[PDB]
């Protein structure tokens, strides 16, 4: 039912294939809901670091799964400039995968 919008641009899928999506049975799906700009969407890929990723979210090298996403800016962004979105960039150090 999700094959109806063009702005899905993250069809690169590492653990399995998007053609093999509804092909084999899965045990326990793990979904994490958040918003990342497309400037560092290539840093989301396993085996890669960056800065926003280096400080808040981490991904395993054996990325069992893959992400679907469309344009957030169209969804939320006031005419005065969306300053409502807040982030954190100045922690002590990095973090291991699957902690917060």
């Amino acid at each position: 039912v999700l094959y109806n919008l063009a702005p899905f641009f993250t069809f690169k899928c590492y653990g399995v294939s998007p053609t093999k999506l509804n092909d084999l049975c899965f045990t326990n799906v793990y979904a994490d809901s958040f918003v990342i700009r497309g400037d560092e969407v290539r840093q989301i890929a396993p085996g890669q670091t960056g800065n926003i990723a280096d400080y808040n979210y981490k991904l395993p090298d054996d990325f069992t799964g893959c992400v679907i996403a469309w344009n957030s800016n169209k969804l939320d962004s006031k005419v005065s400039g969306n300053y409502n979105y807040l982030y954190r960039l100045f922690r002590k150090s990095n973090l291991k995968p699957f902690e917060r």
Partner: antibody
Amino acid sequence: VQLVQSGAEVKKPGASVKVSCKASGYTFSSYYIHWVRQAPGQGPEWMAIINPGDGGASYAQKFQGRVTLTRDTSTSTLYMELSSLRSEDTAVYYCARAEGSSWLGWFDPWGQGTLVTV
Amino acid sequence: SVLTQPPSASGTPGQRVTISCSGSSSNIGSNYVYWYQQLPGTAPKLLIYRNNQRPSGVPDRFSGSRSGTSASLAISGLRSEDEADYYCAAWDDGLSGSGWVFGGGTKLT
């Protein structure tokens, strides 16, 4: 439910101009205004957005940092200041009226425009 | 894009002429298309909403659609008062900048 402009004349080069337009009718804080300039012999270009209430602003890339905006609801005027006027900036200014509560919207009828020359 | 438009579009009374604004990807293909009518000596005015029906009220002589990266509009019944020019408005979403890009100019007799 109508919009009117102000008057303008020839200004000296290397100066700043100020445009104000008045509106009447619907709620001032429940609508959005585009700021456009039309040059003779060429198509119009949109630069600035109006956010009434908090008076928020956003401009284009080629016209940012030289442009000053002031918005208020009690006076219901839009003080639209352009700086560093040159001979290429001879265009008719218009304050539009969007669909409301979104930049993505449809255009209401405009006013009469303000003409400045250098 | 830059909304390329033909410089003129001549015609005769009783004849229908199709005039189009041609763009590119992420401006006409995904974003909506606008058509606005400017009369000489007066304020800028609107011609059409989204290309399905009349904006507020007009006979069905004015109609148009879109295809690929272009938006076409057919005008029939040329009159003396019909002499004006037209503009195309669409969402740009270009690289490092998203200003409302318009078209060039057209001539109707």
